[PDB]
């Protein structure tokens, strides 16, 4: 693999060959033509899962939700042609993306009628049906999370990075809890490291020890980050990891900051997060001993819009942990208001 890196403020280019890891999180949602194994093979697998009691799909990431939305229309063409009464209904995703207990079955016969080659030019829209196979939406009453398939696909060959590249998916034969390693890139070089995939970008630095620096998350997964793709995996307490292991956080010494423990009660309901170590605009933090103990994360602005100005914590290190979403600043679990009662603030209602 040849590649070349450029320094704009010097008009200089150094290059050679090596291993290159790219940031695909700050800009995504390109045009990819997805290829779940086969149109007559995905039809058989979805049909058989409906007869085995599986109601719908709980999506693992934003990539799988997008793939289901592209295939949905053509998937109902192929089924109202073999005579099956079944409709696929795709909805939006909500964070966190919880696990399901089931998995999609590998079919046997690959239904006879239909066409190969995903992406036919012109077919006829299929009529609606009583039965409804539900891909992740706000449908927890139609059939609950205990009857939902989860993590059924493996990426086989992708042309990610550039648009208009086909990525081939396949229904796995086994059962697993780990995130797909085909789209994970980790790299350290000197005093800076990164753990990343299609939705995470987690940075580390070395000050006196290795610590977290910042993280950008455009989703909240719940699979397990594989240890083959992780740096410094030994001698690790799971209660010191800033990003919980149940949210696909790496089990690494690079996932630590001194004075802070695991944030199982952060604002993991947001659509997009950024984890900074910095005070929030208009607030100050002091280290004291009269402060409270850990609790759910709190927003820096009340439900009206008033800014709470003084905060405390017991044994932190400065600068403080913060989360930046569209709503605003939230503080770490250890950082509590100094004067204003906590019943007057907005707290987070989810846990990992």
């Amino acid at each position, epitope marked *: 693999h040849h590649g070349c890196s450029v320094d704009f403020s010097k008009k200089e280019t150094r290059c050679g060959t090596g291993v290159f890891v790219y940031n695909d999180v700050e800009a995504w949602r390109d045009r990819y033509k997805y290829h779940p194994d086969s149109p007559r093979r995905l039809a058989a697998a979805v049909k058989q899962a409906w007869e085995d009691g599986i109601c719908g799909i709980s999506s693992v990431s934003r990539m799988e939700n997008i793939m289901w939305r592209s295939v949905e229309g053509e998937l109902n063409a192929i089924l109202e042609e073999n005579g099956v009464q079944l409709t696929v209904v795709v909805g939006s995703v909500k964070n966190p993306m919880w696990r399901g207990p089931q998995r999609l079955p590998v079919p046997v016969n690959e239904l006879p009628h239909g066409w190969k080659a995903w992406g036919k030019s012109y077919f006829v829209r299929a009529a609606k049906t009583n039965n409804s196979f539900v891909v992740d939406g706000d449908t927890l009453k139609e059939c609950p999370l205990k009857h939902r398939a989860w993590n059924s696909f493996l990426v086989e060959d992708h042309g990610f990075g550039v648009f208009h590249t086909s990525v081939w998916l396949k229904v796995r034969e086994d059962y697993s809890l780990e995130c797909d390693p085909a789209v994970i890139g980790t790299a350290v070089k000197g005093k800076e490291a990164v753990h990343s995939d299609l939705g995470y970008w987690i940075e580390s630095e070395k000050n006196d020890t290795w610590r977290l620096k910042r993280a950008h998350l455009i989703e909240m997964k719940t699979c397990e980050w594989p240890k083959s793709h992780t740096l410094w995996t030994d001698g690790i307490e799971e209660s010191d990891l800033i990003i919980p292991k149940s949210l696909a956080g790496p089990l690494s010494h690079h996932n630590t900051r001194e004075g802070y423990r695991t944030q199982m009660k952060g604002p993991w309901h947001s659509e997009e997060l950024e984890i900074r170590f910095e005070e929030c605009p208009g607030t100050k933090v002091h280290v004291e001993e009269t402060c*409270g103990t850990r*609790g759910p994360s709190l927003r820096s602005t009340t439900a009206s819009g008033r800014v709470i100005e003084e905060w405390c914590c017991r044994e932190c290190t400065m600068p403080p942990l913060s989360f930046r979403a569209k709503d605003g600043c939230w503080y770490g679990m250890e950082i*509590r*208001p100094r004067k*204003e*009662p*906590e*019943s007057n603030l907005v707290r987070s209602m989810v846990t990992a």
Partner: antibody
Amino acid sequence: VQLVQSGAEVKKPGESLKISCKGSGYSFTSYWIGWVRQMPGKGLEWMGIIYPGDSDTRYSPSFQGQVTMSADRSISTAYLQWSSLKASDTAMYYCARSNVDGSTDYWGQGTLVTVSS
Amino acid sequence: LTQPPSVSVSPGQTARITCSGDALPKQYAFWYQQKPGQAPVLVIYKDSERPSGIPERFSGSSSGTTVTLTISGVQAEDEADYYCQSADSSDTYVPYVFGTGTKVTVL
């Protein structure tokens, strides 16, 4: 760590009154101070809280104007003042220490207030 | 917040006192025990935990919009009034609310 109130009072309607709650053993200006009422043979009801130092008061709507909550940082004493006692002011008054998370930790012994003619 | 006016149990079994409120999913709950002639004592804080110096027969749990306090083995000294405190958000008033009171009798 203790809060010590003043003695019981017997007064006639129309007079004024001031009861104190002297805290000691901890930093008086890092915690709120709550006042709670309990009429004879009844439950408890909040009278609002005061924050010494930033002498902020947050009354309950049923008591605003009727009673006046003040503080005194230097002596570590909180106060509760009436302007004209009514016959329906016969109750028990507790001072208490409120944490920011909402738990009332320490209580004073209480203060009888009996109003009659 | 609403509570049962009274609860009567013989020594030995459990007593269950419930406190119902609309904002309890989003707020903490606390339990106080007050015996005749003394000041209230915190018994269960943050609707799950127990302060030091309290017997291990005291515990609490929450379920949606209701919270309950349970005493495993009723003793002759565990009859008193029990109050639940919760909160509602505000900007200028006091946030805290007391329940009504549960008179427990050890028969």
